[PDB]
């Protein structure tokens, strides 16, 4: 579990979005595993605006933050998980590291702020849904 809180937006994995998220929907994209809802309170996070390929991510199934190198966001085949069938996911970054289903929502951060959230795992990789292209998160 986990979310990004930027301005008056809440960014969650689409597959973990709640009824209250869907009832207050700003934007969602199944191909990216992302959903954004509106918030009453302003959030503490800053979104990275950069092309870093190194950062640190939180792994709840280890209670640990790990430094990783990661691929640039791309259209990647993802094997079946507990929450999605095998499919192509877009805007996905991969790193070597541990990720189980409940790790989804852990933040990946670089020197510029939040890069994305954990979205995939298995076979010794962790996949992150990028948010650095969503420039509209930073206003309005």
Ligand X SMILES: */O=C(\[N][C]C1=[C][C]=C(F)[C]=[C]1)C1=[C]N([C][C])N=[C]1
Residues engaged in binding ligand X (CB under 6 A): 10, 18, 20-21, 24, 37-40
Q: For the window 39-78, what string marks contact with Zn ion as x by the rule CB under 5 A?
A: ---------x-x-x--------------------------
Q: Is 44 annotated as a binding residue?
A: no
Rounded Cα–Cα distance for residues 105 and 94 (Å): 15
Rounded Cα–Cα distance for residues 55 and 134 (Å): 19
Q: Whose Cβ is closer to Zn ion: residue 35's or residue 115's?
A: 115
The interface partner of residue 21, options being ligand X, Zn ion, none and the CB cut-off 5 to 8 Å by kind, is: ligand X
The interface partner of residue 123, options being ligand X, Zn ion, none and the CB cut-off 5 to 8 Å by kind, is: none
Q: Does residue 65 have an active-site annotation?
A: no
Catalytic-role residue among 21, 33, 45, 130: 33
Whether the CB-CB separation of 57 and 66 falls below 8 Å is answered with yes
Q: Is 112 annotated as a binding residue?
A: yes
- Residues labelled catalytic: 15, 33, 104
Residues at the binding site for Zn(2+) are 50, 52, 110, 112
The contact set with Zn ion (CB under 5 A) reads: 48, 50, 52, 110, 112
């Amino acid at each position: 579990s986990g979310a990004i809180y930027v301005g008056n937006y809440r960014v969650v994995n689409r597959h973990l979005a709640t009824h209250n998220d869907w009832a207050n929907l700003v934007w969602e994209d199944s191909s990216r595993d992302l959903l954004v809802s509106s918030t009453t309170a302003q959030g503490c996070d800053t979104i990275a605006r950069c092309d870093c390929q190194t950062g640190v991510y939180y792994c709840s199934s280890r209670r640990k933050h790990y430094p990783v190198s990661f691929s640039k966001p791309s259209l990647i085949f993802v094997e079946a998980s507990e929450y999605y069938p095998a499919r192509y996911q877009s805007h996905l970054m991969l790193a070597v590291g541990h990720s189980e289903p409940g790790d989804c929502g852990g933040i990946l951060r670089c020197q510029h702020g939040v890069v994305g959230i954990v979205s995939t795992g298995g076979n010794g990789l962790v996949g992150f849904a990028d948010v650095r292209d969503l420039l509209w998160l930073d206003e309005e």
